[PDB]
Design a protein around this nucleic acid. Structure first.
Ligand SMILES: [Mg+2]
Ligand SMILES: [Mg+2]
Ligand SMILES: [Mg+2]
Ligand SMILES: [Mg+2]
Ligand SMILES: [Mg+2]
Ligand SMILES: [Mg+2]
Ligand SMILES: [Mg+2]
Ligand SMILES: [Mg+2]
Ligand SMILES: [Mg+2]
Lengths: 176, 188, 134, 133, 126, 37, 23
RNA sequence: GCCCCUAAGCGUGUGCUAAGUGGAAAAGGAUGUGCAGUCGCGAAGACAACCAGGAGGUUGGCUUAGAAGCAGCCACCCUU
RNA sequence: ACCUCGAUGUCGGCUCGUCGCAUCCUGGGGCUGGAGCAGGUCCCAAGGGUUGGGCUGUUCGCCCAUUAAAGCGGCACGCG
């Protein structure tokens, strides 16, 4: 409600096309599409911004309003600037490298693991223990980041494993 | 100390059935036997009646408008319910604007005794007599710096002007006793 | 545990549990009382358990009142003999409780502490109850 | 940074300040040497210190005021105080001694005048369980 | 906390505003314990760090001729009063603000008249 | 993960939420993570 | 006990009026 | 009883249900939802969040080798 | 004592199997006062396996060798 009532400020270098329920956006980083909910009406105001409205105040509409608003906001943000998630590797002997378009990690396993980058998402490495993943779809970026994080078992004794940029994991101590 | 106005209409039918119907219709049966007059069976509104009772209740004076015939009255009984809390019947007494009636007023303890003590209120209401319009809605008893083993009785209650205590002055109303310990609590 | 010193009759007829409570409905001694909503027998064991729970939740403060005393005995067969013989002997004492009858009361200053103690006590009873104030 | 209380005629106290300061990687030898050289003038009253550690592991201890509790205890004459406030006394205290300790401690209390210092010290004393005539 | 505590609080607000001369508008949540104690010990020579409530400042603004503070209390605000000279207190406050970049300055009150950010910045030098 | 018919917040930060046709408790402390079953 | 429970529950039918034989 | 089996309404008007509840059940647990009565605050800008704290006395005393605001017991205060 | 005294043959062992998971192992996961191996608790999971002997009619139980294990029960305390 409080979020669904606000407009969506569209930058200059963006092309928004609404057709019924579907809505496509084109920008420098790429293009995206979305299908807003049925009980909500999306419209482009005279100032270019987008506005979503609800014909009723039921629970369904109140929950879908802000949902669709933030969805289109993230869509425009991604097609304008894109999303990026930095990670970090901790633990002696734990390393990561770039092999073409895929990432090869060695986290103490007997064999090195490989993660291939799907469409609309790329990887980058700034150090053998510092890398990041960039893309347009925030959902896909978060999914790939979570996959890369869960690749290794969470170890709170030594913190060995994958971690996000500003991750704060809990740590215990084994006195024996 | 001003009277609370309220409307009231005579009951066109008595009995448990009519009473249950009135209670379902958000009404409250009431009697107005008065101070020696023919009794009248009226129907008050539960909503505003409970509102007035929560505002200044406990034998609050009232002013019934029985078909435009304004008349003072005083509630001298309240049987709400054993389990739930609903006003199922009222008994109002005419005061005649000047009678001296005797009614029980609730007492309330205020203050803080010695930290190593505990206060117990044995009597909640006290038989008080005063003018119909000057009925105190509550009485106050202060407990400051009181030591253990102290018995504040009814006679020690400060009464406003024109107010008298009908009950004996020896009725123990408040008792401050040394705070029981774990042994005293477990040996009971 | 509570138990009468001596009863005129040792064996009774399973005291009936019906209707609403006529007396003991309003709080008189304590400040916060527990009022039951279902008719059922309360045993001296349950009474002692609730009293111990209250006395443990409240340390060196307040006072507790028990407005019910278990005096109605309930017999019990040997649990292995056949049906039909002299009526069994009493084994546990109960207290006929009806909806609307105040069972326990507390005079603790801390309102929240008293409410928590009364809730923990009710949690040890075989019926539903609610906290009321003087 | 931490404020630790310690006696004057002592040296190398392990319980009070041992692990409270050694864990920070501070040198204890010269610290205790300077503390003794500074407290050798009084040598007759417990004196705390608000150790303020620096980034380069250096330190400049700021000699604070004695504790109000121990000041009141030594003014009353007894060494062990009461356990119940306003329920057990130890001895009597003199207004002259109270004013002396207040004048010596004025450089630590938030008070502005000797009257406010006396008020604060009397509040501390009555919270501890002692009163001055 | 308690209504009596808040009443005594407002009483002290009045009893210290009658003594203070200059004041500025900032925020009070300075920083961690160590550096906050250092800042308090540094500004203790002429000022004292403190905080209060919106209702407290609202009920206290009725004593002196600062009734105009209603529009400022229309939304949050933190104050900072000075006891001694102000030409140095304002300088120190501006220094701390520019050093921390988290304590914003919005103005002050002197001579029973409100002053703007530019006005206070210009008069602090003199 | 404690699976008990009765779940309630133990800590102050512990929150209660409604997962798929059931109640659940969550928190940063993995000990207070319980489910209703 | 499932059989007796089902019987005593079906007893509470709108066609029997909460009354049936053998409980 | 009136959707087919199976004879009769996939009846009319006003509301509820997301669990197939309907189409089993107890103590308790629970930001599910609709109605209605109260109480705190609130354009004198309410709650959360963008961004930032909690002092001196003092480490209140007994207890502890120890309790510095966070095994516990007593009170539970003065100043800035 | 509600069918069964003008008959329902009662405990074992052998053969023969079927089904439930309140799971002994294999499989997956959460918390651990989980450093690692090795454990404690819980949740899901019945596809498969779940040894051979001495005592004693025995069921049960003890002991000897192993194995991952040598599961709990219903089927007229399964099966004449
Ligand atoms: Mg048909
Ligand atoms: Mg149910
Ligand atoms: Mg035959
Ligand atoms: Mg035959
Ligand atoms: Mg299972
Ligand atoms: Mg298969
Ligand atoms: Mg054999
Ligand atoms: Mg079998
Ligand atoms: Mg057989």
């Amino acid at each position: 409600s409080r979020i669904g009532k606000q407009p969506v400020p569209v930058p200059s270098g963006v092309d928004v096309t609404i057709n019924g329920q579907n809505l496509s956006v084109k920008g420098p980083k790429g293009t995206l599409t979305l299908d807003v909910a049925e009980p909500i009406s999306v419209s482009r105001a005279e100032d270019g911004a987008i506005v979503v409205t609800r014909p009723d105040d039921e629970r369904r509409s109140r929950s879908l309003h802000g949902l669709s608003r933030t969805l289109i906001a993230n869509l425009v943000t991604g097609v304008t600037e894109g999303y990026t998630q930095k990670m970090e590797i901790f633990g002696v002997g734990y390393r990561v490298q770039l092999k073409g378009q895929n990432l090869e990690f060695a986290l103490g396993y007997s064999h090195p693991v490989l993660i291939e980058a799907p469409e609309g998402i790329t990887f980058a490495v700034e150090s053998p223990t510092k890398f990041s993943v960039s893309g347009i779809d925030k959902q896909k970026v978060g999914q790939i980041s979570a996959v890369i994080r869960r690749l290794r078992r969470p170890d709170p004794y030594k913190g060995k494993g994958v971690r996000y940029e500003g991750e704060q994991i809990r740590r215990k101590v084994g006195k024996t | 100390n001003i009277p609370n106005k309220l409307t009231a209409n005579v009951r066109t039918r008595t009995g448990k059935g009519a009473s249950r119907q009135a209670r379902r219709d958000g009404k409250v049966p009431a009697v107005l036997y008065g101070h020696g007059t023919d009794p009248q069976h009226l129907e008050l509104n539960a909503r505003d009646f409970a509102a007035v009772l929560r505002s200044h209740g406990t034998n609050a004076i009232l002013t019934l408008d029985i078909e435009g015939t304004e008349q003072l009255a005083l509630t001298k009984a309240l049987d709400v319910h054993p389990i739930r809390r609903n006003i199922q019947h009222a008994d109002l007494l005419v005061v005649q604007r000047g009678e001296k009636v005797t009614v029980e007023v609730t007492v309330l303890v205020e203050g803080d005794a010695t930290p190593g003590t505990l206060v117990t209120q044995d009597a909640n209401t006290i038989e008080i007599e005063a003018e119909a319009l000057s009925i105190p809605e509550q009485l106050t008893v202060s407990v400051e710096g009181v030591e253990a083993g102290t018995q504040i009785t009814a006679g020690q209650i400060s009464l406003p002007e024109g107010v008298n205590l009908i009950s004996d002055p020896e009725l123990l109303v408040v008792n401050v006793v040394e705070a029981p310990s774990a042994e005293a609590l477990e040996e009971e | 545990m509570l138990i009468p010193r001596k009863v005129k009759h040792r064996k009774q007829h399973h005291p009936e549990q019906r209707g609403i409570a006529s007396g003991g409905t309003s709080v008189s001694f304590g400040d916060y009382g527990i009022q039951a909503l279902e008719h059922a027998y309360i045993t001296n064991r349950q009474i002692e358990s609730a009293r111990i729970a209250i006395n443990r939740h409240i340390k060196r403060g307040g006072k507790v009142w028990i407005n019910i005393f278990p005096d109605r005995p309930l017999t019990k067969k040997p649990a292995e003999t056949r049906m039909g013989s002299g009526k069994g002997s009493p084994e546990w004492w109960v207290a006929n409780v009806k909806p609307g009858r105040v069972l326990f009361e507390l005079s603790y200053p801390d309102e929240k502490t008293a409410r928590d103690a009364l809730t923990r006590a009710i949690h040890k009873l075989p019926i539903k109850a609610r906290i009321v104030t003087r | 940074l931490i404020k630790l209380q310690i006696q004057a005629g002592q040296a190398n106290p392990a319980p009070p300040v041992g692990p409270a300061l050694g864990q920070h990687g501070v040198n204890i030898m010269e610290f205790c040497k300077a503390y003794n050289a500074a407290t050798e003038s009084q040598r007759g009253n417990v004196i705390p210190v608000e150790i303020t550690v620096y980034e380069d592991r250096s330190f400049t201890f700021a000699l604070k005021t004695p504790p109000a509790a121990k000041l009141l205890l030594k003014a009353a004459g007894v060494q062990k105080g009461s356990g119940e406030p306003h329920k057990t006394k130890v001895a009597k205290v003199t207004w002259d001694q109270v004013r002396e300790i207040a004048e010596t401690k004025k450089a630590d209390l938030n008070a502005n005048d000797i009257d406010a210092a006396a008020k604060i010290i009397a509040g501390t004393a009555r919270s501890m369980g002692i009163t001055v005539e | 906390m308690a209504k009596a505590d808040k009443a005594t609080a407002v009483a002290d607000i009045a009893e210290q505003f009658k003594a203070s001369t200059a004041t500025v508008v900032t925020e009070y949540r300075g920083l961690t314990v160590a550096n906050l104690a250092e800042l308090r010990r540094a500004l203790g020579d002429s000022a004292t760090y403190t905080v209060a409530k919106n209702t407290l400042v609202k009920r206290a603004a009725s004593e002196a001729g600062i009734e105009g503070l209603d529009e400022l209390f229309a939304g949050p605000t933190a104050i900072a009063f000075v006891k001694g000279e102000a030409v140095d207190a304002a300088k120190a406050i501006k220094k701390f603000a520019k050093d921390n970049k988290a304590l914003v300055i919005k103005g002050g009150y002197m001579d029973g008249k409100a002053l703007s950010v530019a006005d206070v910045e210009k008069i602090a030098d003199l | 993960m404690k699976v008990n018919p009765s779940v309630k917040p133990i800590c102050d930060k512990c929150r209660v939420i409604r997962r798929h046709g059931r109640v659940m408790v969550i928190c940063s402390d993995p000990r207070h993570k319980q489910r209703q079953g | 006990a499932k059989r007796g429970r089902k019987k005593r529950d079906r007893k509470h039918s709108k066609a029997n009026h909460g009354k049936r034989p053998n409980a």
